[PDB]
Amino acid sequence: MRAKWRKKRMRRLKRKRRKMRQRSK
Amino acid sequence: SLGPQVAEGENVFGVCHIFASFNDTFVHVTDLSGKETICRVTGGMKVKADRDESSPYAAMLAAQDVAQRCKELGITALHIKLRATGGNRTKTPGPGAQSALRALARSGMKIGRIEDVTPIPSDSTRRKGGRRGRRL
Amino acid sequence: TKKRRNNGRAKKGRGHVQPIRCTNCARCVPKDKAIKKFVIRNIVEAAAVRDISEASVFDAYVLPKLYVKLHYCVSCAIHSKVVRNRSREARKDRTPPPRFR
Amino acid sequence: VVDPFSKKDWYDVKAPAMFNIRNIGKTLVTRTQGTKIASDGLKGRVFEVSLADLQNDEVAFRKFKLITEDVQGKNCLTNFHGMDLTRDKMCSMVKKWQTMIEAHVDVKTTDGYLLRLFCVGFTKKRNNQIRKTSYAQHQQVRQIRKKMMEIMTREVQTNDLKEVVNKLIPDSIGKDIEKACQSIYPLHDVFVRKVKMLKKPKFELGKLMELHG
Amino acid sequence: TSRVQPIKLARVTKVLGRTGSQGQCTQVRVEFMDDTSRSIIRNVKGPVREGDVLTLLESEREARRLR
RNA sequence: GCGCAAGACGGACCAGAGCGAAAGCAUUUGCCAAGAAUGUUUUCAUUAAUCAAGAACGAAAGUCGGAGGUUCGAAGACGAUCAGAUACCGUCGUAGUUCCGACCAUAAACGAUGCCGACCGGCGAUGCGGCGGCGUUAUUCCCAUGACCCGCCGGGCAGCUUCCGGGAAACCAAAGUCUUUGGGUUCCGGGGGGAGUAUGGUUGCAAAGCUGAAACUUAAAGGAAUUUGGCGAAGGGCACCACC
Ligand SMILES: [Zn+2]
Numbered sequence: 146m147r148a149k150w151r152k153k154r155m156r157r158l159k160r161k162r163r164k165m166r167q168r169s170k
Numbered sequence: 171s172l173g174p175q176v177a178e179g180e181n182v183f184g185v186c187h188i189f190a191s192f193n194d195t196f197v198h199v200t201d202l203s204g205k206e207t208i209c210r211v212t213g214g215m216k217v218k219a220d221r222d223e224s225s226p227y228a229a230m231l232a233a234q235d236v237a238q239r240c241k242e243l244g245i246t247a248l249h250i251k252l253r254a255t256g257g258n259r260t261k262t263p264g265p266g267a268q269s270a271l272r273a274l275a276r277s278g279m280k281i282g283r284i285e286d287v288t289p290i291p292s293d294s295t296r297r298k299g300g301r302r303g304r305r306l
Numbered sequence: 307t308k309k310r311r312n313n314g315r316a317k318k319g320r321g322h323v324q325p326i327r328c329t330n331c332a333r334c335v336p337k338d339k340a341i342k343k344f345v346i347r348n349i350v351e352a353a354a355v356r357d358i359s360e361a362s363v364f365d366a367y368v369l370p371k372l373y374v375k376l377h378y379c380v381s382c383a384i385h386s387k388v389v390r391n392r393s394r395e396a397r398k399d400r401t402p403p404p405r406f407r
Numbered sequence: 408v409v410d411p412f413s414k415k416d417w418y419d420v421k422a423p424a425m426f427n428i429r430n431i432g433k434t435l436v437t438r439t440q441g442t443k444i445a446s447d448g449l450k451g452r453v454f455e456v457s458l459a460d461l462q463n464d465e466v467a468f469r470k471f472k473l474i475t476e477d478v479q480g481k482n483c484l485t486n487f488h489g490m491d492l493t494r495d496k497m498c499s500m501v502k503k504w505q506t507m508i509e510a511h512v513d514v515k516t517t518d519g520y521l522l523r524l525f526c527v528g529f530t531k532k533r534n535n536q537i538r539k540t541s542y543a544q545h546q547q548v549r550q551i552r553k554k555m556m557e558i559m560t561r562e563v564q565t566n567d568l569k570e571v572v573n574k575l576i577p578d579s580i581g582k583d584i585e586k587a588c589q590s591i592y593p594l595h596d597v598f599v600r601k602v603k604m605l606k607k608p609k610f611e612l613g614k615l616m617e618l619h620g
Numbered sequence: 621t622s623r624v625q626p627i628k629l630a631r632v633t634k635v636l637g638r639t640g641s642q643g644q645c646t647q648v649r650v651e652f653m654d655d656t657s658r659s660i661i662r663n664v665k666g667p668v669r670e671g672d673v674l675t676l677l678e679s680e681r682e683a684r685r686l687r
Numbered sequence: 688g689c690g691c692a693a694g695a696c697g698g699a700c701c702a703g704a705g706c707g708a709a710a711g712c713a714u715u716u717g718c719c720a721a722g723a724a725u726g727u728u729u730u731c732a733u734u735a736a737u738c739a740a741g742a743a744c745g746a747a748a749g750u751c752g753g754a755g756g757u758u759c760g761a762a763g764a765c766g767a768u769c770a771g772a773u774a775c776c777g778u779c780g781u782a783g784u785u786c787c788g789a790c791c792a793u794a795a796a797c798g799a800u801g802c803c804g805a806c807c808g809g810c811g812a813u814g815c816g817g818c819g820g821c822g823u824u825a826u827u828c829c830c831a832u833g834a835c836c837c838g839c840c841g842g843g844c845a846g847c848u849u850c851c852g853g854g855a856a857a858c859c860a861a862a863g864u865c866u867u868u869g870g871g872u873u874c875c876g877g878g879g880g881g882a883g884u885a886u887g888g889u890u891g892c893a894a895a896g897c898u899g900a901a902a903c904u905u906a907a908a909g910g911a912a913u914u915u916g917g918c919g920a921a922g923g924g925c926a927c928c929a930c931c
Pocket of ligand 1: 329330332333
């Protein structure tokens, strides 16, 4: 895949990971 | 309809508006003021296929019909006013406009001044479509 | 690699220019990049001029002309056969194409 | 369905006395039945005629808009409504490698006639000029606009509508502007492209009678 | 329709190059006998020469290139 | 065809033209403030160049609060296309697009070429300021001015040619003056992936910005150019094993 949509996908994955960590308090 | 004027020396003047686009043609005839129309035909009522609404033959048939109606109603001289779709869309007139002009010439009608009334803007409004246009 | 001396445009001391729209397409293209064609056309082309001139009210009537400037995107200009591809030595030639009449 | 064109009446339109050819043409309107009067539909009509069809042997790229204001029977008496140029001449005068000047005023005559004159002025390539540019600096453009403003205001303010429209049949305003704007930058193509109407006074029929001789 | 067109009769003056997608029609420059000064261009189908008399069901339609 | 109301925008003039540190800037007029370059036999006399910390500005998209919403139009509702089409196409349309007030500091923010200074070829043009000169014009004489013609100087955006020279080459009058290696100075890279990733700090209402690894895995990933390769690339010709 091209770099732009890969960076968007990794942004979405990082947002999901941050949400899961902030809900795993 | 009929007038008391002589049919030998003087001629009766009207204007005719040829609004032609890439899809359809209009051959409209009004009086000198333009407020009172006479008879309006389009290439959509000369052929029973809307694909051929922009054909030269439909415009030719419409021009012959409107010229016969104006001849039998009492109009013998016309001023040409050509027009495209105007706006920001395009400025080149439709492909049946000069065909309708020639068919108006063949039917026995006098032609006077020829002008164009395309509504050209001073960068009014953005066109329909995206930044990349229509990709076809 | 770098293909042209300029970058396919004429922007040398600006950084930003006004974008225009294509005629056939609606693509937003900068003004100094789009290929322009100021064509002067007449109302009746080659055979209807005698048709108007013989059947007319005014004698010695000059036929009016239509003036229009066309803005073309690069893909639309190549697709509409306005410009073509040229060789590596003939790419650096900025003269207009020759005209016969 | 009855024939709609059998209940029409053919009328006439008459140019004012400051032109040569009084006859313009014929219009049509329905007859007088009901609450609607046939003379009402002849009120708000604008007739657009070229200058060569109205004067005798003059230019043809100028048009005059004429509006009927009063009717006396079987003819419609017209009045001035504006002046405009043709589109092909306006597109032909605009060319590259020369700068472009516009100017406009809000002038009023000796009566209630607020005009809005528009005019253009184009720079001239000299006969022995080698340079292709022939541009002008911005302050020369400002002085040319000031001279155009002064000439347009000075020529209409002291006259009524009849004299200034009599001056509009030739391009004497254009000749005065081209004579004035010569020590700044030489101009060659000066025309009055458009004249509008803003305010109409109270309808007086007598002035319309001296306007037709 | 409600208006019959008279069958105009015409005679060719010069033949141009071959047109059409598969080369099945050719360009001609043709003139009329009732009006000798009038000339018009048309697409004809079949083998033609210079000087032959050819029939037209209409005298208003123009010619066309390969499309 | 004639009038009204609202919002947006400023065509053709518009150019390998101008200005600004950059992002950027195009209707007319009025007001305020700033600036480059040119001119000078003015004035101070080393006040200079590049710069961690710190500070200003910064496209569009994005968020919060208002007035306003013409057109275009993310999400969405459809109609065709298709094996599928929640895509290309067409009809509507929500946030947004426009202004005010508060925020983030991101782009292929690119001449993909830091700033200051010196030297090293030629030519014709172009924008600004100044100097000189036959002539034409603002109607016939004189002077200054504007508009042309011919040259010169200084700064700037650029062009053509070159066995100066350099480079892996494309190319470059700088990317030259570099093994005959040193003018001053700031930032920055050591094969590819993991990876602008995890954690820590910090900034922001939020979206997110700045700083920024390692384990592991691989012998390649790359840059320039020439002939047969295929183009649903273009320009010319040919074939009844192609067509009409
Ligand atoms: Zn396009």
